[PDB]
Structures are given as C-alpha cells and as structure tokens.
Amino acid sequence: MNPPPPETSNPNKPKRQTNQLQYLLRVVLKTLWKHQFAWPFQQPVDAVKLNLPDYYKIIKTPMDMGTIKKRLENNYYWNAQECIQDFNTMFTNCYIYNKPGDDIVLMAEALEKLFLQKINELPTE
Ligand SMILES: CCc1c(C(=O)Nc2cc(S(=O)(=O)N(CC)CC)ccc2O)[nH]c(C)c1C(=O)CO
C-alpha cells in the first residue's frame, strides 16, 4: 500500500519569509505546475491505484510537487536549498524506478530542464 504523504508542516520549526522562498513558490513551482507534463508530479504516486506494488520498495524517499507546494505555502522550509533538494529528489526518483525512453522519464527530463532555467534567476540569499 501507500505510505502517508511527506510531512508538510513542522510545529517545532520556526518560520520566515525570504525573497528566495517566495520566488520558489510564485515563479519556480508555479511555472512547473502549469507545464503540460506537470500532472504526474502534482501529487504523491498512488501505487495502489496505479498497481505499482514495488514502487515504495524501491523508492524510500518519495517526493512530489504537491508536497513541495504545500511545504512552501506552510513555510515548512527555512532554507531555499531544502526546497531545491526536494525537487532534485523528485526527479532522481524517476530515474531510479523507470527506464530510458519511458513516458514518465521524458516528462521528468522536460520539467527538470525548465526547473534549471527557473532556478537560474533565483534571487540572492
Ligand atoms: C507512471 C507512474 C508515475 C506517475 C503518475 O502519477 N502516473 C499516473 C497517475 C494517474 S492518476 O490517476 O493518479 N492521475 C489522474 C490522471 C493523476 C492526477 C493515472 C495514470 C498515471 O500513469 N508519477 C510518477 C512520478 C510515476 C513514476 O512511475 C515515477 O517513477
């Protein structure tokens, strides 16, 4: 079955607003979210519904853009790099579970390319 989704709130962690964090939500995440190939990445992989029973045997650090969006909205991240790492994990997981030429892999490649173009103009710390 599925694990619970990743935590999107931490009550023992302080919160701050930064130029970088605002950009990550309003520019980076927003732009990826609206991409034609965003849909497989907008929520946790539902392995039960999709009948992918080995998915969470193979992927022990799942991540998705729905989670990332909620983390940003909830001020879950203190440092911008925490958010960037989550995107990286999300992409890397595809390359672990799937094979070259799989639809999902081509979709990940397009999103990652876009992600890098957007992170390029990330405001300074
Ligand atoms: C191909 C499986 C997969 C998805 C995915 O989500 N595929 C998906 C979702 C649904 S759906 O019913 O849940 N659905 C309604 C359309 C989405 C809102 C239906 C069919 C699907 O192929 N994502 C990732 C990262 C993977 C990986 O294999 C990654 O290693």
**The one-letter amino acid at 53:** P
Among positive and negative, which fits the CA dihedral 93, 98, 99, 104? Answer: negative
**CA distances in angstroms from 93 to 1, 17, 74, 114, listed in the order given:** 18, 29, 24, 17
88 lies in a domain?
Answer: yes
6 lies in a domain?
Answer: no
- Can you give the residue range of the structural domain that contains 98? 18-122
The answer to whether the beta carbons of residues 52 and 108 sit under 8 Å apart is no
22 lies in a domain?
Answer: yes
Whether the CB of 37 sits within 6 Å of ligand 1? no
Burial degree of 71 (CB within 10 A; 0-12, 13-18, 19+)? buried
117 lies in a domain?
Answer: yes
Cα angle 111-79-62, degrees, rounded to a multiple of 5: 45
What technique was this entry resolved by? X-ray
Spatial distance between the Cα atoms of 9 and 104, rounded to a whole number of angstroms: 29
- Ligand 1: centre distance to CA 80 (Å): 27
112 half-sphere exposure, CB direction, 13 A CA radius: 17
12 lies in a domain?
Answer: no
**The one-letter amino acid at 109:** E
Task: Find tokens 């694990």 and name the residue.
Answer: 3
Q: At a CB cut-off of 8 Å and minimum separation 6, what does 124 contact?
A: 19, 20
83 lies in a domain?
Answer: yes
Whether the CB of 5 sits within 6 Å of ligand 1? no
89 lies in a domain?
Answer: yes
Spatial distance between the Cα atoms of 42 and 45, rounded to a whole number of angstroms: 9
Spatial distance between the Cα atoms of 72 and 67, rounded to a whole number of angstroms: 9
**Listed resolution, Å:** 1.7
CATH code (residue 50): 1.20.920.10
Number of domains in the chain: 1
59 lies in a domain?
Answer: yes
Q: How far is CA 103 from the centre of its chain?
A: 18
